Amino acid sequence: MSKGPAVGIDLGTTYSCVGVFQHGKVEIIANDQGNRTTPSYVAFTDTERLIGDAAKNQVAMNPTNTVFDAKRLIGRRFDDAVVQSDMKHWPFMVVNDAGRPKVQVEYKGETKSFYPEEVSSMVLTKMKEIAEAYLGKTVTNAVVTVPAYFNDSQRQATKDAGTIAGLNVLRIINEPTAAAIAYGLDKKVGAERNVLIFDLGGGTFDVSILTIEDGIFEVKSTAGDTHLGGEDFDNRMVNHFIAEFKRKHKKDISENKRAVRRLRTACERAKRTLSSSTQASIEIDSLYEGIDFYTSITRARFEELNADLFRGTLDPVEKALRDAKLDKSQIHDIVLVGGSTRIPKIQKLLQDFFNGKELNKSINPDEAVAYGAAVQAAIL
Amino acid sequence: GPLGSNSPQEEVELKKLKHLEKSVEKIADQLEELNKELTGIQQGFLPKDLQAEALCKLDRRVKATIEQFMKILEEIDTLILPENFKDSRLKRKGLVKKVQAFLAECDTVEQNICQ
Numbered sequence A: 001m002s003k004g005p006a007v008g009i010d011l012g013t014t015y016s017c018v019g020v021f022q023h024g025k026v027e028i029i030a031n032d033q034g035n036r037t038t039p040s041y042v043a044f045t046d047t048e049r050l051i052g053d054a055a056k057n058q059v060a061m062n063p064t065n066t067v068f069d070a071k072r073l074i075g076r077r078f079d080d081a082v083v084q085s086d087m088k089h090w091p092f093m094v095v096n097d098a099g100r101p102k103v104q105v106e107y108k109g110e111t112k113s114f115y116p117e118e119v120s121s122m123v124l125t126k127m128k129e130i131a132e133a134y135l136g137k138t139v140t141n142a143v144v145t146v147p148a149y150f151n152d153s154q155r156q157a158t159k160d161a162g163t164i165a166g167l168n169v170l171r172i173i174n175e176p177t178a179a180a181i182a183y184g185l186d187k188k189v190g191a192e193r194n195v196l197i198f199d200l201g202g203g204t205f206d207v208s209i210l211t212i213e214d215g216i217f218e219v220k221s222t223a224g225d226t227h228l229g230g231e232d233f234d235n236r237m238v239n240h241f242i243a244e245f246k247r248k249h250k251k252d253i254s255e256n257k258r259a260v261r262r263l264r265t266a267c268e269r270a271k272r273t274l275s276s277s278t279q280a281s282i283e284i285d286s287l288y289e290g291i292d293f294y295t296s297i298t299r300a301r302f303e304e305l306n307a308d309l310f311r312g313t314l315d316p317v318e319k320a321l322r323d324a325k326l327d328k329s330q331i332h333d334i335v336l337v338g339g340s341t342r343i344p345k346i347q348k349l350l351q352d353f354f355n356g357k358e359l360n361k362s363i364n365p366d367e368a369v370a371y372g373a374a375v376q377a378a379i380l
Numbered sequence B: 001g002p003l004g005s006n007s008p009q010e011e012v013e014l015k016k017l018k019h020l021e022k023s024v025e026k027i028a029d030q031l032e033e034l035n036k037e038l039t040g041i042q043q044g045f046l047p048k049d050l051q052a053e054a055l056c057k058l059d060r061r062v063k064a065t066i067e068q069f070m071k072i073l074e075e076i077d078t079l080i081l082p083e084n085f086k087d088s089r090l091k092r093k094g095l096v097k098k099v100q101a102f103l104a105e106c107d108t109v110e111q112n113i114c115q
């Protein structure tokens, strides 16, 4: 293989994305399964190590030895509140190695422990291989993104994950800076530009306020919810359907894990349909005790079941504006990042709050961070 | 709707279901091979410590078979069939019931080994 170009990689908590600038535009690279985003999942089995789609596709079969959310651990001390809170939720072991957390798994009949940067390096290796598979050239140089609130230890641990993967990490840039670069907000003519990045994707919610003056990005404030996303929207739909089944059939399906899974999978798909249609239908034969469940949900009902969650997203906006000492009329640009910003009610709340101000959403939200990281990678 | 009104559009849905029937036949064969291996371990010369490992390796395989059957149900659940597509609706119901009977068999194995 010959010498390849520089890539932009968005290393996410639940999914990762790689992009390359070629022939005048950014191309988001599809993985071996044809997916434009790859799960940030590493699975340790009796005979092998799986990364990406292959790791998530066996999560139900091997829950204790399938690691994800390493980004929630990377560069943190074991005693950190975030690590201690998060641990209860995870099916895999998190041990204390002299003040530093380590994921403990069963790999090839042996109990083995890994650092969060080692797990992320495996995810980075996969992202590198995806780009090499498409370009047909060796990929060494990369711009890797990190959240704006990441401290020195979290930033260095991300650079170390890059180094372990054999990548030359040209630059580590903030995720809201990458999103701003994707839309060319630093290339706009005038005085200092105040930008709000609304990031609702991968199970986290992050709001950042940036000031761009003469190409210098300044993080004025950060706010958000560490555990808020599409999974919560799906859960509210599942509750609605479980209640509907109790009303129509006087049967509780909630303790049959397979019936709940079939319902949850159908709900996630219906939620996606409700982003471009006002109605979605679901047909599930023999859901529980031989009962067929044929139903539908309107966009309006989906919004009602999630009203507190959707409205809730504006509190972080209010908190970030107050911390940055800025009124809402002082924001010149609003950028949408993450798959859940595709929800029409979410866009409406954010546009209404900013008094009819048009949102920057033309670039797929799931891809905008890797898109800007790839633009930055081409400039270097 | 009307009877003897077979449409070219239903041919498309029936082709999707036929592919899923084939995939279920393949997963079913795997289940039968797991059953033969189960009997093999039980009627073989493996001592307690070695049969334990052999049954757990089998447990992982059973879990893979259950997951594959679950991914077939999810795929079937993406189908929306108009009331008039009677032949498709009957084939979808028979396939789901066939998968649920194989899942019940997997559970018979899964609960009897490696625990």
Ligand SMILES: OC[C@H]1C[C@@H](Nc2ncnc3ccccc23)[C@H](O)[C@@H]1O
Pocket: A201, A202, A203, A229, A230, A231, A268, A271, A272, A273, A275, A338, A339, A340, A342, A343
């Ligand atoms: O992967 C993280 C989030 C993003 C969410 N995606 C979406 N959520 C809502 N509407 C969508 C419409 C089209 C495409 C994707 C959509 C998806 O369901 C998941 O919960």
